[PDB]
Amino acid sequence: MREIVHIQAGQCGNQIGAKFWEVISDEHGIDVYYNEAAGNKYVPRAILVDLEPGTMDSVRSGPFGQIFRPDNFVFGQSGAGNNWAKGHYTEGAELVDSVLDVVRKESESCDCLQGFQLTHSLGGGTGSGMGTLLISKIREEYPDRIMNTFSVVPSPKVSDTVVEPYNATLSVHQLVENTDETYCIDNEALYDICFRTLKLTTPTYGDLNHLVSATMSGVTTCLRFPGQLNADLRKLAVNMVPFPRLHFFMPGFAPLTSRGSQQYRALTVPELTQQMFDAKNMMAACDPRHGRYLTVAAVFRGRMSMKEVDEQMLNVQNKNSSYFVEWIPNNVKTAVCDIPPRGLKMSATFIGNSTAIQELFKRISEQFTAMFRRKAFLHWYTGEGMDEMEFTEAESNMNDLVSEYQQYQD
Amino acid sequence: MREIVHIQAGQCGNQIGAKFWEVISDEHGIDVYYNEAAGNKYVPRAILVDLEPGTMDSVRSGPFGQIFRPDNFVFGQSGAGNNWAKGHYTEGAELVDSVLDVVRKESESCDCLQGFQLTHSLGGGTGSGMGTLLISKIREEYPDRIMNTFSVVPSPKVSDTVVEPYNATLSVHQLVENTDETYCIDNEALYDICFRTLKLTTPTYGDLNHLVSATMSGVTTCLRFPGQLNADLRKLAVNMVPFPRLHFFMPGFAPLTSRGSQQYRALTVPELTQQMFDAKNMMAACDPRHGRYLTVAAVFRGRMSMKEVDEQMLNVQNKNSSYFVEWIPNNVKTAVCDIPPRGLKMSATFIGNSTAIQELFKRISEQFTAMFRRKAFLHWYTGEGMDEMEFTEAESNMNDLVSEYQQYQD
Amino acid sequence: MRECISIHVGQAGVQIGNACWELYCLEHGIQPDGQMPSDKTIGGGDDAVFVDLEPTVIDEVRTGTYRQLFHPEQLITGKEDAANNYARGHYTIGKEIIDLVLDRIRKLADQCTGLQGFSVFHSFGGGTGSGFTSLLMERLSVDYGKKSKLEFSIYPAPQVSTAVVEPYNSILTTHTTLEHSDCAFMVDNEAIYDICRRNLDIERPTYTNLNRLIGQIVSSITASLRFDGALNVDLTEFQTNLVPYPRAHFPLATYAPVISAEKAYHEQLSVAEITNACFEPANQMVKCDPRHGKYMACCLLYRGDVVPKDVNAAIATIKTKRTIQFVDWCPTGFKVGINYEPPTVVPGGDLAKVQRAVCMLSNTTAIAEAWARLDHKFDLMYAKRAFVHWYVGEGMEEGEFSEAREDMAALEKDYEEVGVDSV
Amino acid sequence: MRECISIHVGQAGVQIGNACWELYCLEHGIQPDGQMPSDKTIGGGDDAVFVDLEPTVIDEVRTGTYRQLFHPEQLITGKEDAANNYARGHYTIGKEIIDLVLDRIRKLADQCTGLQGFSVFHSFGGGTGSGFTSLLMERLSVDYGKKSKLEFSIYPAPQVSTAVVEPYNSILTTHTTLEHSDCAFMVDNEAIYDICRRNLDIERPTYTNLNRLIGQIVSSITASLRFDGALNVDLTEFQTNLVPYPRAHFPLATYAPVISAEKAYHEQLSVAEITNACFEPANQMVKCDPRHGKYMACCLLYRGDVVPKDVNAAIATIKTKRTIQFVDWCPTGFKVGINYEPPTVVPGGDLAKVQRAVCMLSNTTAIAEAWARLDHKFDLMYAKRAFVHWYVGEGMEEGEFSEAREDMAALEKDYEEVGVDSV
């Protein structure tokens, strides 16, 4: 029933969303066995969508270059580089119709439609302008249905004098438009892991992308197939979203370790219950130790002593009592689900609504008022409409959350 | 002529009133022989009446399950549990018409109609709400005729948070409505006998019911058939009822003894004249030694020296001169009546209007004002009309007797 | 010739009466007379009204019978099992069978010229025959005023049979007097359940035992003085001697030669060996004590051939005793009557035949005593609450008493207006 | 004969109920009855309405089944994966499958004359079966008013399963009372995840473990008192004893002889060795503490042949303890009922068969405690912001709360209007 219509748009988005289906290992036959194949029939319900021709890269490559192929979107020849207005007002509003023609001739497919978990990386107008559009285009059409998004925030590092003033015009609605619920990654945090903790003298996208997938899957398919009891893709948005202007989830795997005779507690059962709850292992990197979490979901993976897990998960819930709002009676729930990944023997998966992501927000906030307002560079969007504001009413929004969030962070 | 129209209603009433006709042993032919068959032709004039289907139990069972069968009352399917309002305002006002249709097509039957001795046990609405209704329904219709009732008072023991606040709304008229005369048993006293005196490590209803019948018969059929001279069912109500709001009779067999070589005076002729006149052998258990008796009837059974009996009966009448009102010139009369029961060789039968039953009244009185007034539990009757009082004007009645009775008890 | 009519209302009366025409076996009034009214004019020209309110006690004559039957028709009967609330039988029910009885009577009391008389066998203390006769008479007196009335009313027994019983007498006498009856012979069952237990042994004096004895006495009165023969009497002349003032004074009765059969009659008792026991307390009817009271009469009745010259022999001896004593306004003497006819006894029923029967009649101002004590077991309850509500919820009243307690009080009042002083 | 109808809405209920007709294997109501309604009239004349909102948990019966099937038709089901926003399942969705359920019921509750009864197996704290039943009843009560209603609503577990969960109870009770239900047995999963872990060992008390135990208790109630036999009871007469005021008071449950198999049952426990543990905290349902509260009732239920003479033996011993204590307006006693029928256990599921089953029912004014704490984990958030916007953006409200917090507040209010004073 949790018929999930997986969306995957944008070049530097498909690349991640792709090798995700690489992580979803159960192939096309040849395999609990009481499977919960949510989405569509035995061909990824995925609906890849790119502005340029990036739907091919490793997309239609070595991994699984067969994502329902005869549906893929490109339109045939186009562009849309790093111009939001582009792919959300222009060279995409061409494509939309195309997509909003194949997702529907895909969404439907009898079984009750879960919603749409749309993948992409905020601040890159190709598929983070096309997609942020899709949303407001899948929305106000499928109100009822719950929408999801695994948006990727442009590392504070700063690529492009534009890979930044970008997305700040997204969390201007990617939180007031269909997005009842959306996890969020911070490339910053990703370098830092392949550096500040895990090894790697440099993170090949074949590095600063691994976790990106062994983290989604660690929240996707689980809380989905058999394991302990069940779960769907929506009772969540009601236990993890205390408010309308919701809050962005701060995902966070755990057993990352590094090579070596990984004896760092050698994945001790209680380790998972520490190897995870820290910014040294969070996918948004924002000192969780800042504000409390209005809620938090856990997802222990790899069959092991369920005792220890509730003995440990409450532990810290009984530990940093300084970081759990404490006006939301039982702001936590564990989840244990049998069948493990491909190399951990044990593994967890953070999913907390911690008011710490605040940082990962007032960032893409003190760059706009501190640039696109401090003066300009916006004289690159007006080309495609966008005259004047639309960058200030957009600044009079995502900037808000500072306050909003700061109101419970306390 | 003493055409008695025997009534028997209510589940836990038929059960007793039934095995009574078990006690009335003279069967259907095959037997002084100058019989006084009062009631009806050779089929119990009995008119069994139940709200539920209890008219069958042992009713139409092993004993004599042939009580004119083709007349019995049930209506066919119904209820009326422990709700007075029920079976006297509701699920019974259905039945009434049924009964007050078959008793009449029975009462009449040529020969002058004695009256109606209605059996039942106060406080249980089935047939102690239906019956207490029948009365007021047989009354104000057959004024002339004298009515009788062998009501059973709910042992102070207390069954049901309701087998109590029940009857207290009965003696609210079961003494101002047809009932010119009515004997009265107290289950309390019954346990106590099969305990405090007679044996029995527990009283099966096949125990705490025996006396109930070998006591009625001991007042029924006698003072009825041949024996010494005669008697009917009404000159009584005139020698035993000094006042309108009358007084309830406190019946009381005697030769109860117990097993064993019953040599306890081995039923001495003067024993009956003691084995009876005491609360250790009274069916109401109320320390008769309290107030004097306004009157008292005796009924010696089992052919024996009538001399001793008047020599003994006056004896105590000349004995506890402290317990015989003494403003009612000859407040006693004996009765001797030949043919005995089925195991005594001698047996008596108390029937006195002793102001001691006062207790067995101010009981079902310091529970209402001490409950159904002390606050509530009455919010179970209003369902069926009965709004407000009707529990207080009922409390402003049966509670009275206290005073009334206490006025000669002295 | 001139026959007086008799009517026994009520079990106590029916049963009595029933055992009298059994005693009235004294001569011609038995054989093939069944419906043979013809012949001589006396003992009953058809040896008669039996009216009970309980169709049964009065049924041991016709339906089921009882060794005999006079005339199936003269025994009125109802259905109403009983009553026992005076009103309940004097008013309510009574009023129903009182016109079949008053019609029957008149249609009997009006047969063969010259009436004169009504012996009402009663019994008070129990409605029906306690309350219905209270009316019978109120009726008769309305249609036979010029005729006299006698009544052997059976007085209640201290062995006290019934409560509400004491009080009947009172709401009864109150009008069952002036408004009828010139004479009336109080019996007082107490008496017999005592005498028929002493002078006649007998352990538990059965009603018949007590009837075969209240029945004898009745003969030695009515009968004793109601068939010409020799020395005689007239009903009219029954009060003239026995009845001081219109205040219906109740003459006291006393039979003397009573001997069972199992004990020695002593061959005989001098015609005077008797007429002293005849003056012995325990041989009276009303359990009185004329030991405190000035007779206003006193007149012996010897029976079964006796010669006067021997009678006074004791009327003397006695006289010689300072006791007795009369009043004033009356020749402190007698009126002795002798009957040659022998004393009739029945088979085991009367027990032994006597040679000389003796039963006198005096109205001592002492009966008032055992006659007002019956006013105590009344002024007792019936003044302090009592079973008064039945004589209501079954008829009218609420002073059916009181109102009728004064005249029945003024009695022991009158009984002194002839005993406290020299007037 | 007269059968009461039962309807289990919601996984927690479906699962429970599902494991009860499994416990209801106590005698005749199994073999070749599949579609054989005929014969005797009880245990279910066709041993019934299963309505869940998640077509699946309630699918381990028909499609895929689950070791059995009563009657493919009486298990209503939707598609809407779930809900979990009370409104979301009480209004919105509910409003859809509420007329196939209310229709089916009526077309069941109206089969074979004489209805009387509705045992609604519940479970609150999670829409569907928390919000859809809040409506079911609002419906039934509209078309069976004269009929009574029981409901074994499973209380949430402090092991806290879900947020927004606490708050359902409140926007639930507020009308799932007066507007229905005379009685309702609070379970409180907390309890079992504790007892079925102590008195029954077991490490991680699986739902079935907890169902094979809330399921037993239910028998030792409904069943325990719903098949004539000997000493009996009537649904009408379930509150009369257990239900003080219309304020639907929630009677507290307590089973006593609980023994696994792997540990010693001790051959047996005196018929009194039990009826004390039966008074031991840890053996109750709602994790209360009647240690501070005047019982307004209290009535034992022994099961599996027992002779009264031995029962009171403890009802005594206990009495001897100054503790306990009742109120006033109630004869501080019992209502003890004994069943001869032996305690039915299942293959590893119930764990060991007892000789003597014991499960009483008292409504102590102390349940109010563990019953308002559930009002704290609400007055907490749901007063200071909370997830209130879902019970909106999926239906109406904005006082769907508060408005419905007073009466559900007035409860611990009432629960003192029967405990703070001598009235």
Ligand SMILES: Nc1nc2c(ncn2[C@@H]2O[C@H](COP(=O)(O)OP(=O)(O)OP(=O)(O)O)[C@@H](O)[C@H]2O)c(=O)[nH]1
């Ligand atoms: N002399 C006499 N008295 C009797 C006899 N039988 C009963 N009695 C007494 O007379 C009274 C009995 O009255 P009942 O026969 O009861 O009544 P009743 O007034 O004759 O008529 P009912 O009211 O219809 O019964 C009591 O005082 C008895 O003690 C009898 O054979 N002879």
Ligand SMILES: Nc1nc2c(ncn2[C@@H]2O[C@H](COP(=O)(O)OP(=O)(O)OP(=O)(O)O)[C@@H](O)[C@H]2O)c(=O)[nH]1
């Ligand atoms: N007593 C008892 N409670 C149970 C059982 N299973 C679940 N629960 C309770 O029901 C709730 C768990 O509900 P979930 O399984 O999360 O959801 P659901 O009831 O299917 O959800 P809805 O369809 O929206 O009603 C908690 O309050 C549990 O304590 C069971 O077998 N027995």
Ligand SMILES: Nc1nc2c(ncn2[C@@H]2O[C@H](COP(=O)(O)OP(=O)(O)O)[C@@H](O)[C@H]2O)c(=O)[nH]1
């Ligand atoms: N974590 C992660 N971030 C990526 C990846 N590819 C691109 N990005 C991010 O995407 C931004 C630049 O590329 P993107 O915006 O995806 O390009 P577009 O698809 O053409 O719109 C930067 O902020 C990068 O951090 C990837 O594989 N992993």
Ligand SMILES: Nc1nc2c(ncn2[C@@H]2O[C@H](COP(=O)(O)OP(=O)(O)O)[C@@H](O)[C@H]2O)c(=O)[nH]1
């Ligand atoms: N004397 C007597 N009382 C009984 C018997 N069975 C039940 N009772 C009592 O009768 C009392 C009055 O109610 P009940 O008789 O049950 O009412 P019913 O069901 O309408 O007939 C109850 O308190 C019972 O304890 C029996 O056989 N004899």
